[PDB]
Symmetry: C5
Subunit: 103 residues, 5 copies
Amino acid sequence: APQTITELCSEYRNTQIYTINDKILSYTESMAGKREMVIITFKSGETFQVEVPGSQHIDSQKKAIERMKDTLRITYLTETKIDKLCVWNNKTPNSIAAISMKN
Amino acid sequence: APQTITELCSEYRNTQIYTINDKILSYTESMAGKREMVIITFKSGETFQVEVPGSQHIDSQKKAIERMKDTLRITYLTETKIDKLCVWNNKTPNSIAAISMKN
Amino acid sequence: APQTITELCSEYRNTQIYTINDKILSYTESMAGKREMVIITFKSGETFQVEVPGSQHIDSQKKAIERMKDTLRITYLTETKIDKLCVWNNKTPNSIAAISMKN
Amino acid sequence: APQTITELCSEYRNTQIYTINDKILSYTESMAGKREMVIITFKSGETFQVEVPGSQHIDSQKKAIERMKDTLRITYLTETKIDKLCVWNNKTPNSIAAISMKN
Amino acid sequence: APQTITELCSEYRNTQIYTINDKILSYTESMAGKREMVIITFKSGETFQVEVPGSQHIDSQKKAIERMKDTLRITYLTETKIDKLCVWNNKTPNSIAAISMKN
Ligand SMILES: CC(=O)N[C@H]1[C@H](O[C@@H]2[C@@H](O)[C@H](O)O[C@H](CO)[C@@H]2O)O[C@H](CO)[C@@H](O[C@@H]2O[C@H](CO)[C@H](O)[C@H](O)[C@H]2O)[C@@H]1O
Ligand SMILES: CC(=O)N[C@@H]1[C@@H](O)[C@H](O[C@@H]2O[C@H](CO)[C@H](O)[C@H](O)[C@H]2O)[C@@H](CO)O[C@H]1O
Ligand SMILES: CC(=O)N[C@@H]1[C@@H](O)[C@H](O[C@@H]2O[C@H](CO)[C@H](O)[C@H](O)[C@H]2O)[C@@H](CO)O[C@H]1O
Ligand SMILES: CC(=O)N[C@@H]1[C@@H](O)[C@H](O[C@@H]2O[C@H](CO)[C@H](O)[C@H](O)[C@H]2O)[C@@H](CO)O[C@H]1O
Ligand SMILES: OC[C@H]1O[C@@H](O)[C@H](O)[C@@H](O)[C@H]1O
């Protein structure tokens, strides 16, 4: 298995690493129909989403999608510095695939 | 996908944005039959609910409804300042569709 | 929908409001068979339960019962002041229907 | 229903109350097959488990077993003082039936 | 049942104990398809994973896998010192079977 977020990100098409090195500036969460998603922004101006679950996701990703949103909320609330994001860049906003944080 | 709560809110009928810019004043949670819901208030006097799950909700909203109540409780407990709420105004109290918080 | 805990409580038979205005003194949690429940007490001497799930509960209440126990544990741990409880008084200890907290 | 941990404990064969009056010294969690369990110890030298789910458990106990492990982890992390444990003494380590904490 | 992480670890083939005695340096979480996993590192240079769920896991381990990832995230966030890890050494990075923390 991959040993780092960069190694993991390299396994996928339509991905890149953003080096954030910052806490989340804003957290947005929606339960509106067809828009059940989270949006985060950074003071850099960058915006990312956790996508609405759909056919681009396999069954094993369902719990992982819910965990990622859990992680983003608590990261926001604790002002925890995010190191890197691996994102799909074929979506607007870019879609989060993986997150790393270092201490 | 939308990049902000205001963009998201505009996609729906019977919605508006409330600019809260404040922590939650009170948190109310009910497990009583047919009233399984959360109500929050602000010192402004405004009151909002997360609705009881019903036929106005699609399957993808079920986990999202539970998440929103999770978010409101921890937001209350941490005295986290809410930025905006996107609400359905065809309900009393107005019904929460999305929340944003900024730091 | 109701706008306050008192309004909500008034919709049900065999209920009343206790005004607590205090943190939880003790928290008890059981996983013993047929006694899967939580008991809380206050320095006033009042004791309350979240009942074991049973036929007095409809399907919509199952997640709500689990949320209520989640709420009591974290409220206990954070020493959060409870404002009111709406309880069913036809049970010993009185059984929690709703909880409010204010800040 | 019982109003205290001692009342509840008394309802069961093969149980006893340990008065702990202390925080958890160590927390151990296993996801190893057939050993999906939690072990806690105290500076007293006592060791307790939450048992692996098995045929000695009824369906209503499944969520309660998961809740108890959730409770022990957060109690450990917050250094919360445990008051009493109701344990089954026909297991090694003794198996947790109920927990109480007072403030 | 085992009374310590070392006793538990000894029940399994392809395992060993790492004595960590340190907080987590980095936390990485992925929701990418077929890589739904967590990776942690320590300043020692050691790297560990919670494996993607697969046929090497029995049904009883599914909830335990999810709990282990929950534990690693909160442990990271709270800077909680890990005592030992029991890991399967037939995987790269080594795969976490059990964790202990002491206070
Ligand atoms: C169902 C089960 O126990 N699976 C494990 C597997 O079991 C073997 C039995 O299927 C076989 O019949 O008997 C032998 C003992 O004589 C085994 O118990 O054994 C494999 C390999 O040892 C285990 O795989 C391990 O799984 C863990 C995760 O649970 C981890 O991924 C580790 O890397 C891996 O080797 C099965 O657990
Ligand atoms: C079943 C399967 O392998 N499906 C893949 C898709 O995952 C993939 O789409 C990507 O999906 C991710 C999230 O899983 C994200 O939404 C990306 O934007 C999206 O492109 C698709 C194209 O690579 O291939 C399918 O095989
Ligand atoms: C199946 C479907 O799309 N149904 C929608 C409804 O969502 C919508 O009702 C709104 O639902 C939201 C919660 O999702 C909230 O309760 C609003 O108060 C409610 O009006 C309905 C009416 O506009 O349109 C349907 O198409
Ligand atoms: C099955 C059903 O709908 N039963 C209702 C009950 O809700 C109600 O009983 C009350 O149930 C609550 C928990 O929901 C609590 O346990 C109360 O103590 C209990 O009385 C019953 C009595 O009014 O009415 C039924 O129709
Ligand atoms: O509910 C679980 C309990 O069930 C009993 O019947 C058993 O003797 C106890 O040791 C405990 O495991």
